[PDB]
């Protein structure tokens, strides 16, 4: 939502940038250090993500336009994707969050073009 985008742009060094914020409002998140931290911030603020517990797959399922329990294959597929990214070995917390969310890119893009289950318990 608008509020979280604005607050995260202030919380993250470099993120209060006109050009970057045009991307963010368009659900476009480039692979750069500022955006890494921005994506982490949004994930934390919306409780979609946690540095320790990773991606809340149920919260993300709900953020993809659903109100029910996540499909089992959605949970399985993303648990496996996230495990394959060896997130615990990524020292930079922003890079870690950005890498984690790459697993859900296809889902968010499909949802956008149409309009707890922590991965690391």
Rounded distance between C-alpha atoms, residue 87 and residue 92, angstroms: 10
Backbone angles phi, psi at 16, to 5 degrees: -85, 60
State the nearest-atom distance from the C-beta of 94 to ligand [N+], in Å: 5
> What is the contact surface with ligand [N+] in residues (CB under 6 A)?
9-10, 12-13, 15-16, 37, 40-41, 47, 56, 59, 64, 71-72, 82-83, 85-88, 94, 107, 110, 116
Pick 28 or 112: Cβ nearer ligand [N+]: 112
Helix or strand holding residue 104 (H, E)? none
Pick 22 or 110: Cβ nearer ligand [N+]: 110
Rounded distance between C-alpha atoms, residue 117 and residue 93, angstroms: 20
Residue 65: other Cβ atoms inside 10 A: 10
State the nearest-atom distance from the C-beta of 26 to ligand [N+], in Å: 19
Nearest alpha-carbon partner for 87 in 68, 75, 72, 103: 103
State the nearest-atom distance from the C-beta of 22 to ligand [N+], in Å: 15
Pick 26 or 68: Cβ nearer ligand [N+]: 68
* 92 token code pair: 């930079």
State the nearest-atom distance from the C-beta of 4 to ligand [N+], in Å: 12
């Amino acid at each position: 939502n608008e509020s979280v985008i604005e607050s995260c742009s202030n919380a993250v060094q470099g993120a209060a940038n006109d050009e970057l914020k045009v991307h963010y409002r368009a659900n476009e998140f480039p692979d750069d250090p500022v955006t890494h931290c921005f994506v982490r911030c949004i994930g934390l603020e919306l409780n979609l993500y946690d540095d320790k517990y990773g991606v809340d797959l149920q919260a993300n399922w709900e953020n993809l336009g659903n109100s029910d329990d996540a499909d089992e294959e959605f949970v399985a597929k993303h648990r496996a994707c996230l495990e394959a990214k060896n997130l615990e070995t990524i020292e930079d917390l922003c890079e870690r969050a950005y890498s984690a969310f790459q697993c859900l890119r296809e889902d968010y893009e499909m949802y956008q073009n149409n309009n707890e289950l922590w991965s690391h318990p």
